[PDB]
Amino acid sequence: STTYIFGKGGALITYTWPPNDRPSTRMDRLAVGFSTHQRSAVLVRVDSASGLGDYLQLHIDQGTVGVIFNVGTDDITIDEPNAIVSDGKYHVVRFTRSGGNATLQVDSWPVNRQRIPYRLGRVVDEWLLDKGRQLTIFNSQATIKIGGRDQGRPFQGQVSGLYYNGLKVLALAAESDPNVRTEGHLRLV
Numbered sequence: 001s002t003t004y005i006f007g008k009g010g011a012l013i014t015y016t017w018p019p020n021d022r023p024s025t026r027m028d029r030l031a032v033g034f035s036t037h038q039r040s041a042v043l044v045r046v047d048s049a050s051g052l053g054d055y056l057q058l059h060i061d062q063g064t065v066g067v068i069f070n071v072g073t074d075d076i077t078i079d080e081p082n083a084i085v086s087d088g089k090y091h092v093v094r095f096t097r098s099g100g101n102a103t104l105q106v107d108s109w110p111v112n113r114q115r116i117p118y119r120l121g122r123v124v125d126e127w128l129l130d131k132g133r134q135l136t137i138f139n140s141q142a143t144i145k146i147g148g149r150d151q152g153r154p155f156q157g158q159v160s161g162l163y164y165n166g167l168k169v170l171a172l173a174a175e176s177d178p179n180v181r182t183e184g185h186l187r188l189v
């Protein structure tokens, strides 16, 4: 696992697909480990090419993980309101999108009366029961931006082992892949 520390003042890791083979997908799969004391941050954002409305965004609002996405139609929110993640401890998020449906999993190891921190998984599913086929495709994904600096909501804390549709974006940043740029106050562990 590759780990980055996002320090004070923000940082940005950006993966840019080659402009002539940008993926379009029905299903997206995001995994990421992190720790932060922030109650409000953007962690990951995938943007479609300019001129398209499509995006995927992983964030923390009021101390809980949520994902908001748009594949052409409406903004779709899936939140995990029962897991506090802003305690400075390690959490793992797993997000799968399928059309306008999504699964959001948040793993934690809570110490609570003090106890042995066995794992507590919390999964949320979100389905759209709309007769006929809706807009299901995330079109021409252009950038994955990690650290929230371009949303004005900079992440501060650790990020570990990010995985998005096959890409281990942090392993590629650490090895200086030509499609990754790293900026700001960032350090590799």
Ligand SMILES: *[C@@H]1O[C@H](CO[C@@H]2O[C@H](CO)[C@@H](O)[C@H](O)[C@@H]2O)[C@@H](O[C@@H]2O[C@H](CO)[C@@H](O)[C@H](O)[C@H]2NC(C)=O)[C@H](O)[C@H]1NC(C)=O
Pocket (backbone or CB within 6 Å): 098, 099, 100, 101, 127, 128, 129, 130, 131, 132, 133, 136
């Ligand atoms: C989005 O998900 C819907 C609904 O999923 C179905 O319903 C329940 C919701 O709780 C869920 O438990 C099941 O997993 C189940 O699949 C999908 O809607 C289905 O679409 C297919 C093909 O169009 C139809 O044959 C079904 O009638 C229809 N189900 C219903 C209840 O309308 C939808 O396909 C899916 N979208 C994508 C892109 O995967």
Ligand SMILES: [Ca+2]
Pocket (backbone or CB within 6 Å): 054, 071, 072, 135, 136, 137, 138, 139
């Ligand atoms: Ca679309």
Ligand SMILES: [Ca+2]
Pocket (backbone or CB within 6 Å): 128, 129, 130, 131, 132, 133, 134
């Ligand atoms: Ca449908």
